[PDB]
Amino acid sequence: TAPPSLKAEVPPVLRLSPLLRELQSRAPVCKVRTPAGDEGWLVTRHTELKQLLHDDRLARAHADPANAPRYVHNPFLDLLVVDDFDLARTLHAEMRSLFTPQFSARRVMDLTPRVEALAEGVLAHFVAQGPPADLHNDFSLPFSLSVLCALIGVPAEEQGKLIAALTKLGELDDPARVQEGQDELFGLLSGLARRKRITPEDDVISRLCLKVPSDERIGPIASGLLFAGLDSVASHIDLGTVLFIQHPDQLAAALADEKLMRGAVEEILRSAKAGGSVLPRYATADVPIGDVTIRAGDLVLLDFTLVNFDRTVFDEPELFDIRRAPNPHLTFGHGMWHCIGAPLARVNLRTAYTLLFTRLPGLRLVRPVEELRVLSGQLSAGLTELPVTW
Ligand SMILES: C[C@@H]1[C@H](O)[C@@H](C)/C=C/C=C/CC/C=C/C=C/C=C/C=C/[C@H](O[C@@H]2O[C@H](C)[C@@H](O)[C@H](N)[C@@H]2O)C[C@@H]2O[C@](O)(C[C@@H](O)[C@H](O)CC[C@@H](O)C[C@@H](O)C[C@@H](O)CC(=O)O[C@H]1C)C[C@H](O)[C@H]2C(=O)O
Ligand code: HEM
């Protein structure tokens, strides 16, 4: 297969696939065939990813968005792209000025007692019947979701439908099912905005109303935030928990020392996914990078965790070392595109690991890790299940 194809099934969890390892050793920027069947440029190395994150010729913009080369087939992902390059710039700037104040240090610090309290409640439900239990579906997802709902302003009576609607939102190669969850989610969130415009509450939707006069527009905006943080946080709770099970003496040191726990969270972010953490861009003009020229209109695949195994940056990247320092991973991106939820994601993760392992020090897998499976055909795909006992 020339160019190499990315849809090479799914590698085992917590391991860098042979395909991606050879692509990275081959060149910093590689032409590949995407899961959707089109052609794209995979950025494989740390320095080149950083450079492209700071190059204003990469954008969520294309002269013909409907016909542009695709990474995967998903209409919700397609909503990030507009056909006017000036409009793409101003929309991106606007979105960052809307969202950045919601994740200030004061706000995340102030939310933290609430985050810890939500973790405690989810844990009670997770352990209520004793072991074994599914860490993914009965702790990681409900905890990740309850935090996002508390911050965004989704009441309890609607959180039950969210996991379902958000699941069908991420489905690949089924535009009709993505449209269903899109309909259901956009209608739910914009109705909340209509209410909170009249009766403001301490949540993000209420504060978005003060700068976004359209309730309709708050639908996709809020949906973006939820989808950006739900599976991303949940899957890192899952995989970080496995990494800790596999490295008990490092887990013991992280539990005894908060600074070591912060380092451990960073090492889990660096290494848990081990490639495949791709978001797309398009070139709006020719971009020379490494020894190739990305052409205007071309698809560019930014893989934010493949670069965390770049041997020219990380010594022994395949080893889990919570004391790794410095730890310049790019899991949250960089620059003008840097993940706005990163401070919240970090609090969620250290809250989860701290609570889980102090309450359940015997946590272990029910079956060998080789038997875990990632859901297929899913944007932001996580484990089907994570059975644990304690
Ligand atoms: C300007 C507009 C307009 O006015 C309005 C009218 C339009 C709004 C448009 C809304 C549509 C939003 C787009 C969502 C797409 C998500 C794709 C996720 C893909 C996830 C990928 O997954 C893969 O999939 C493959 C198939 C599998 O083979 C792989 N093994 C793997 O699983 C990679 C996963 O990514 C990360 O997860 C983080 C991502 O979430 C981030 O945090 C959000 C980034 C992005 O979402 C930012 C937006 O979301 C912010 C949004 O808010 C913008 C916004 O409204 O602007 C408003 C103001 C973390 C996971 O570790 C990583 C992972 O899994 O490795
Ligand atoms: C461990 C969990 C998470 C990871 C690994 C992660 C990763 C990322 C990455 C790599 C990007 C850059 C995407 C690109 O350049 O196209 C990004 C952007 C973004 N993330 Fe996250 N994220 C996480 C959690 C969250 C959470 C919890 C939220 C919201 C509560 C969030 C909201 C956003 C937003 C709004 C953007 C768009 C920034 C922009 O377009 O300039 N993320 N995230």
Q: Is 244 helix (H, G, I), strand (E, B) or coil?
A: helix
Q: Is 278 helix (H, G, I), strand (E, B) or coil?
A: strand
User: What residues pair up with 388 in beta bridges, in sequence order?
Assistant: 133, 365
The two structure tokens encoding residue 384 = 């089907």
Tell which one of 212, 373, 380, 384 to mutate to probe ligand 1, the residue whose CB is within 8 A of the most ligand atoms.
Answer: 380
H/E run at residue 239: helix 215-246
72 lines ligand 1 (CB under 6 A): yes
Nearest-5° Cα angle at 33, 31 to 38: 110
* Number of Cα atoms under 13 Å in the Cβ half of residue 160: 2
Name the CA dihedral angle for 82, 87, 91, 94, rounded to a multiple of 10 degrees.
180
How far apart, in whole angstroms, are the C-alpha atoms of residue 349 and residue 212?
A: 31
Q: Give the long-range contacts of residues 79-83, CB within 8 A, separation 24 or more.
A: 79/220, 81/282
Measure 341 CA to ligand 1 centroid, in angstroms.
12
Measure 279 CA to ligand 1 centroid, in angstroms.
7
How far apart, in whole angstroms, are the C-alpha atoms of residue 224 and residue 136?
A: 22
* Number of Cα atoms under 13 Å in the Cβ half of residue 242: 28
CATH of domain 18-389: 1.10.630.10
Q: Is the bond into 28 cis (omega within 30 degrees of 0)?
A: no
Is 112:347 a contact under the CB 8 Å cutoff? yes
Is 133:387 a contact under the CB 8 Å cutoff? yes
Phi, psi of 305 (to 5 degrees): -115, -20
How far apart, in whole angstroms, are the C-alpha atoms of residue 279 and residue 86?
A: 21
How far apart, in whole angstroms, are the C-alpha atoms of residue 340 and residue 33?
A: 30
Tell which one of 227, 330, 339, 348 to mutate to probe ligand 2, the residue whose CB is within 8 A of the most ligand atoms.
Answer: 339
| Strands 133-134 vs 278-283: parallel, antiparallel or unpaired | unpaired
Is 338:329 a contact under the CB 8 Å cutoff? no
How far apart, in whole angstroms, are the C-alpha atoms of residue 382 and residue 121?
A: 23
H/E run at residue 181: helix 175-198
* Number of Cα atoms under 13 Å in the Cβ half of residue 80: 16
H/E run at residue 141: helix 141-152
Q: Whose CA is nearest to atom 28 of ligand 2?
A: 341
Tell which one of 9, 83, 279 to mutate to probe ligand 1, the residue whose CB is within 8 A of the most ligand atoms.
Answer: 279
Q: Where are the beta strands (DSSP E) in the chain?
A: 29-33, 39-43, 58-59, 133-134, 278-283, 287-289, 292-294, 299-303, 364-365, 387-389
- What one-character DSSP code corresponds to residue 295? P
The number of the ligand 1 atom at minimal distance from the alpha carbon of 382 is 32
Q: Whose CA is nearest to atom 19 of ligand 2?
A: 339
How far apart, in whole angstroms, are the C-alpha atoms of residue 189 and residue 286?
A: 39
The two structure tokens encoding residue 2 = 């020339």
Residue type, 264: A
73 lines ligand 1 (CB under 6 A): no
Burial of 197 (0-12, 13-18, 19+ CB in 10 A): middle
Phi, psi of 210 (to 5 degrees): -70, -20
H/E run at residue 77: helix 75-78
The two structure tokens encoding residue 382 = 């996580």
Q: Where are the beta strands (DSSP E) in 131-198?
A: 133-134
The ranges assigned to domains in the chain are 18-389
Please give the biggest Cα pair distance in the chain: 59
Token match 């797309």: residue? 280
244 lines ligand 1 (CB under 6 A): no
Residue type, 35: P
Question: CA–CA distance from 46 to each of 5, 52, 66, 264, 294 (Å)?
Answer: 21, 10, 31, 21, 17
Is 3:26 a contact under the CB 8 Å cutoff? no
User: What residues pair up with 303 in beta bridges, in sequence order?
Assistant: 278
Q: Whose CA is nearest to atom 63 of ligand 1?
A: 277
Measure 389 CA to ligand 2 centroid, in angstroms.
32
How far apart, in whole angstroms, are the C-alpha atoms of residue 304 and residue 307?
A: 6
Is 174:379 a contact under the CB 8 Å cutoff? no
For 319, residues 6+ apart whose C-beta sits below 8 A from its C-beta are none
Q: How many residues can be counted in the chain?
A: 390
Burial of 4 (0-12, 13-18, 19+ CB in 10 A): middle
The two structure tokens encoding residue 74 = 């998903």
Measure 389 CA to ligand 1 centroid, in angstroms.
32
342 lines ligand 1 (CB under 6 A): no
228 lines ligand 1 (CB under 6 A): yes
Give the Cβ contact number of residue 190 at 10 Å.
20
How far apart, in whole angstroms, are the C-alpha atoms of residue 138 and residue 350?
A: 18
Give resolution in angstroms. Answer: 2.0
How far apart, in whole angstroms, are the C-alpha atoms of residue 259 and residue 261?
A: 5
DSSP string spanning 201-226? -SSHHHHHHTT---HHHHHHHHHHHH
How far apart, in whole angstroms, are the C-alpha atoms of residue 183 and residue 168?
A: 11
How far apart, in whole angstroms, are the C-alpha atoms of residue 271 and residue 82?
A: 33
Query: Could you tell me which of 208, 204, 180 has the C-alpha nearest to residue 76?
Result: 180
Question: CA–CA distance from 241 to each of 357, 361, 387 (Å)?
Answer: 9, 11, 12
Q: What is the 3-state secondary structure (H, E, C) of 7-56?
A: CCCCCCCCCCCHHHHHHHHHCCEEEEECCCCCEEEEECCHHHHHHHHCCC
How far apart, in whole angstroms, are the C-alpha atoms of residue 91 and residue 97?
A: 10
Query: Could you tell me which of 351, 247, 262, 266 has the C-alpha nearest to residue 305?
Result: 266
- Helices 141-152 + 215-246 axis angle, to 10: 150
How far apart, in whole angstroms, are the C-alpha atoms of residue 245 and residue 353?
A: 11
Phi, psi of 313 (to 5 degrees): -115, -40
The two structure tokens encoding residue 132 = 């074994």
How far apart, in whole angstroms, are the C-alpha atoms of residue 156 and residue 297?
A: 44
Q: Is the bond into 368 cis (omega within 30 degrees of 0)?
A: no
Q: After which residues is the chain broken (C to N over 2.5 A)?
A: none
Give the Cβ contact number of residue 221 at 10 Å.
20
How far apart, in whole angstroms, are the C-alpha atoms of residue 207 and residue 356?
A: 33
How far apart, in whole angstroms, are the C-alpha atoms of residue 265 and residue 251?
A: 11
